[PDB]
Paper text:
BfmR is the response regulator of a two-component signal transduction system (TCS) which propagates the signal from its corresponding sensor histidine kinase BfmS and acts as a transcriptional regulator. The OmpR/PhoB family of response regulators is activated by autophosphorylation of a conserved aspartate residue in the receiver domain (Asp58 in BfmR). Phosphorylation induces an equilibrium shift favoring the active conformation, which includes formation of a 2-fold symmetrical homodimer involving the α4-β5-α5 face of the receiver domain. This homodimeric conformation facilitates the effector domain to bind DNA and modulate transcription.
The crystal structure of the receiver domain of BfmR was determined, lending insight into putative ligand binding sites. The space group was determined to be P65, with symmetry-related reflections scaling much poorer in the higher-symmetry P6522 space group (Rmerge, 8.6% versus 35.2%, respectively, to 2.10-Å resolution). The final refined model possessed a defining electron density for Lys6-Thr125 for both protomers, plus 181 modeled solvent molecules. Moreover, the divalent cation (Mg2+ or Mn2+) required for autophosphorylation was not observed in the electron density in the cleft neighboring Asp58. A search of the PDB revealed that this specific homodimer interface has not been previously observed for response regulator receiver domains. Predicted binding hot spots exist at the homodimer interface and the phosphorylation site.
Residue numbers in the entry:
A (entry chain A), B (entry chain B): 6 to 125
The structure:
């Protein structure tokens, strides 16, 4: 009965390294690399939390938020290299509960994931 | 029926400038400058959200957080110059829902406040 995390990240190698670390810290973690696939997968699998990049093939992160939010109310943590002020404000306003700059220290990501899961 | 914000910040001038900005954006905002006073004030006034610095006289931000949490369940956004990885993890683990580095752009702070209020 571990918390289920879905990592949505185009960088396959980065996604996996992040996945392995979170798994080592009491989380069950899956990885999706396509934005359109993420929308379908998030709605059907209903992860406890989504770690979401803004830049994605198929559908970008902002579009992923808009499309899943009517059917998915769990925390979404945006994790991206798109770190300008406008980008951050826009992500949050579109439905992300957090917006984190890459590269993120593993422990910091874990702490933010835990804090979000705490308020559900 | 505006959201009520309490800013807890030792820099009186910075606190006021931040207060004025948030007020201009549909928030009711108060300012507290002492950690010990903040604990009493947060518990009794029950703000909809607290903007909380780590560095405070009387009682530090982590202590304030620790002390109010059994009697205060609303969002706490830590806003501080204490930006080390360990500091961030500790703040979140202590009960903060967000942890933001100073100086923060006004629009970004507003967005984070709204996202946090959204999750109640």
């Amino acid at each position: 009965k571990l918390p289920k995390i879905l990592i949505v990240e185009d960088d396959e190698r980065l996604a996996r390294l992040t996945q392995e670390y979170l798994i080592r810290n009491g989380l069950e973690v899956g990885v999706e690399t396509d934005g359109n696939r993420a929308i379908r997968r998030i709605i059907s699998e209903q992860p406890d939390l989504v770690v979401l990049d803004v830049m994605l093939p198929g559908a970008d992160g902002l579009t992923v938020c808009r499309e899943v939010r009517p059917h998915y109310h769990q925390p979404i943590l945006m994790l991206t290299a798109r770190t300008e002020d406008m980008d951050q404000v826009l992500g949050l306003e579109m439905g992300a509960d957090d917006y984190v700059a890459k590269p993120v220290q593993p422990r910091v990501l874990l702490a933010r994931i835990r804090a979000l899961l705490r308020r559900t």
